């Protein structure tokens, strides 16, 4: 439950947000890798 609540708070916390339109390529890589990790925590936490 702690993992689910933290992942929801991180994704919605990024959706608050500054909303940059322009990123660098490595910033795009850690960008997609980052939010994909968070949603992965949400799915696994749901079934658990």
């Amino acid at each position: 439950l702690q993992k689910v609540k933290h992942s929801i708070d991180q994704v919605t916390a990024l959706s608050d947000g500054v909303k940059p339109k322009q990123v660098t390529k490595n910033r795009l890589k850690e960008y997609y890798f980052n939010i994909g990790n968070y949603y992965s925590i949400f799915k696994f936490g749901k079934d658990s």
Binding site: N26, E30, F33, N34, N37
Partner: protein
């Protein structure tokens, strides 16, 4: 909050750039649950130290001479990760301080007066403290404040981080003294640039700097270094004429909030991927735009600082005394006639009463400072708050590793000439009862054992070394079912049989009832199956000599002490059944207080020694109330040691080898902290 990012200090924009590159490339190889880097920018090192103290940053790397400015109040920092400078075959923690000059300038160390000098910073080790401390007592009075009289001794200089407003001569070569890489004269390469541009005549650096900046052998052939005994010498043979040795640069951190494990995790996983040329893409120890950023360039790996070692133990005693007497400015005289009184160390309130009574019965030569465990009191001798104490050989080994020497020994046999006659040492035995006649040295498994304390000779080293040859396990809570060994970890069964309460269980002092020799004999009488004590434990305690209730009913006959072959042999002849010879207890102290502890203790033992009868109603140094307070109760006199004052000399070869077979198994943190010093 992710709560595992590690914020960091940068001094200028170059170091901030390397910090951002370090963040980006350390984002890749670590999982997202792992630690990460955050970059916080400050203006100097001092603003960073105050930032870590005010919880705005977490770590920075700085010199040993700035560690002394770091651990002071209210900063209260602590070194956590050191680094080694050699190859990975031989890690070298120390490095060399050298003085590099132009060729054929024509002055030795004595003719140094009024020359232009290039220092690598105010308070750093190889630039400030060693060069000023060597020539320090030749300056004329007033010495205070230091950099004023240094500013008069030199005819123009550059010392970064000094006060340019209050002192112009320190900032005479440099236009304005700035604590950053943005200053072109700051740092190891900056001081060597101050020599190369000809604005300075002498520059003080470490040994590797001239090899880092110059790549042509003739450029190594011009510049020279001047020696301690006033000779020129080329720079390639830097091992002959180093000024002094210094400890490594260190990563500092807070004392309470830390956090140590996360810095060591981050720098460890950075070390394995980026440090020694594992990736050609990113370098941890170099950068194109600036050098010496975030770390040294001459470093080649990181080493963990053990958790017992604080800053005052990290720098050693000689270097802390050098930086303190250099900063304050005393330049000591040392007449050898008088001697200041000796600060004896005691422990846990049953030693302090008898120690204070001895401080008053002596005229004033003995004063008492105390601790709670003996590992704290050895460290308190190392730092300087204490002077001497009495230890058995198991701790004379540890304090011998930490840098203490033994001065006097204890004799345990009466003679007309005991002070001059050396004693061969006492015996270590195990004691069992007549009721358990099935017991054998071949089979002790699952039987209850009683020890004196962890780390002692007859209680710990001599039995568990032999059992280490038989079991081939380091752990001994598996072989024995239960037992009482004070000083162990609380989780073992070896504390589950001990008796003191509450929270004083297994405390290695006199607050535990089962501590020592006699307390282990109470372990055997009450709840144990075997005890490990000295050979004279049963005749002292049995026969109705103790006025305690547990010991008056005990007989000397019915106990019995077993040999190593399996034979069962009585107490009166110990010479059949002994496990090994153990050396006597010794009095240890530092090297500089060797002569004074010798004179004060021999002068002191002639008055209060063994010839004093009528003990109640007077004072006795050796006679105690059956608890072995400050000494062992059968000590007749303290033998003089000449030609044998070293732990490996005094302890003899067989016992040192016997502890060396138990070298990988001991869990005392103080031995680990004294063995990190060795490269």
């Amino acid at each position: 909050v992710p709560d595992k990012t590690v914020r960091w200090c940068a001094v200028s924009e170059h170091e901030a750039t390397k910090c951002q590159s370090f963040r980006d490339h350390m984002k890749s190889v670590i999982p997202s649950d792992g630690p990460s880097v955050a970059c916080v920018k400050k203006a100097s090192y001092l603003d960073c130290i105050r930032a870590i103290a005010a919880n705005e940053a977490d770590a920075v790397t700085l010199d040993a001479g700035l560690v002394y400015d770091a651990y002071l109040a209210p900063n209260n920092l602590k070194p956590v990760v050191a680094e080694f400078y050699g190859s990975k075959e031989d890690p070298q923690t120390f490095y060399y301080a050298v003085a590099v000059v132009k060729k054929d300038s024509g002055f030795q160390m004595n003719q140094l007066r009024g020359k232009k000098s290039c220092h690598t910073g105010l308070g750093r080790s190889a630039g400030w403290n060693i060069p000023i401390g060597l020539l320090y007592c030749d300056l004329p009075e007033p010495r205070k404040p230091l950099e004023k009289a240094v500013a008069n001794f030199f005819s123009g200089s550059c010392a970064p981080c000094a006060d340019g407003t209050d002192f112009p001569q320190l900032c005479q070569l440099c236009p304005g003294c700035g604590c950053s890489t943005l200053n072109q004269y700051f740092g190891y390469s900056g001081a060597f640039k101050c020599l190369k541009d000809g604005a300075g005549d002498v520059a003080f650096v470490k040994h590797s700097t001239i090899f880092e900046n110059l790549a042509n052998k003739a450029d190594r052939d011009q510049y020279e270094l001047l020696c301690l005994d006033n000779t020129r010498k080329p720079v390639d043979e830097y091992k002959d004429c180093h000024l002094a040795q210094v400890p490594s640069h260190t990563v500092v951190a807070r004392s309470m909030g830390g956090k140590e494990d996360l810095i060591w995790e981050l720098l460890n996983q950075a070390q394995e991927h980026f440090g020694k040329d594992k990736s050609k893409e990113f370098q941890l120890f170099s950068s194109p735009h600036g050098k010496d950023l975030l770390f040294k360039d001459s470093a080649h790996g990181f080493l963990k600082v053990p958790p017992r070692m604080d800053a005052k133990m990290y720098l050693g005693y000689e270097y802390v005394t050098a930086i303190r007497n250099l900063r304050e400015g005393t330049c000591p005289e040392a007449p050898t006639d008088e001697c200041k009184p000796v600060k004896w160390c005691a422990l846990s309130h049953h030693e302090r009463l008898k120690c204070d009574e001895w401080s008053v019965n002596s005229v004033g030569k003995i004063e008492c400072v105390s601790a709670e465990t003996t590992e704290d009191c050895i460290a308190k001798i190392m730092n300087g708050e204490a002077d001497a104490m009495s230890l058995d050989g198991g701790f004379v080994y540890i304090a011998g590793k930490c840098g203490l020497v033994p001065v006097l020994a204890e004799n345990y046999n009466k003679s007309d000439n005991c002070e001059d006659t050396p004693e061969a040492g006492y015996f270590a035995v195990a004691v069992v009862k007549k009721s358990a006649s099935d017991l054998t040295w071949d089979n002790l498994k699952g039987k209850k054992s009683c020890h004196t304390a962890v780390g002692r000779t007859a209680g710990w080293n001599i039995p568990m070394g032999l059992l280490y040859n038989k079991i081939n396990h380091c752990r001994f809570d598996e072989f024995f079912s239960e037992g009482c060994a004070p000083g162990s970890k609380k989780d073992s069964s070896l504390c589950k049989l001990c008796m003191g309460s509450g929270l004083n269980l297994c405390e290695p002092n006199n607050k535990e009832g089962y501590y020592g020799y006699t307390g282990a004999f109470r372990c055997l009488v009450e709840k144990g199956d075997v005890a490990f004590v000295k050979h004279q434990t049963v005749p002292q305690n049995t026969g109705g000599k103790n006025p305690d209730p547990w010991a008056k009913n005990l007989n000397e006959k019915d106990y019995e002490l077993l040999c190593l072959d399996g034979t069962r042999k009585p107490v009166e002849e110990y010479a059949n059944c002994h496990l090994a010879r153990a050396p006597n207890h010794a009095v240890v102290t530092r090297k500089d207080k060797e002569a004074c502890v010798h004179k004060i203790l021999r002068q002191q033992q002639h008055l209060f020694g063994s010839n004093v009868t009528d003990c109640s109603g007077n004072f006795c140094l050796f006679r105690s109330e059956t608890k072995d307070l400050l000494f062992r109760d059968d000590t007749v006199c303290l033998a003089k040691l000449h030609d044998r004052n070293t732990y490996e000399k005094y302890l003899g070869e067989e016992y040192v080898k016997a502890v060396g077979n138990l070298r990988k198994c001991s869990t005392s943190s103080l031995l680990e902290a004294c063995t990190f010093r060795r490269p």
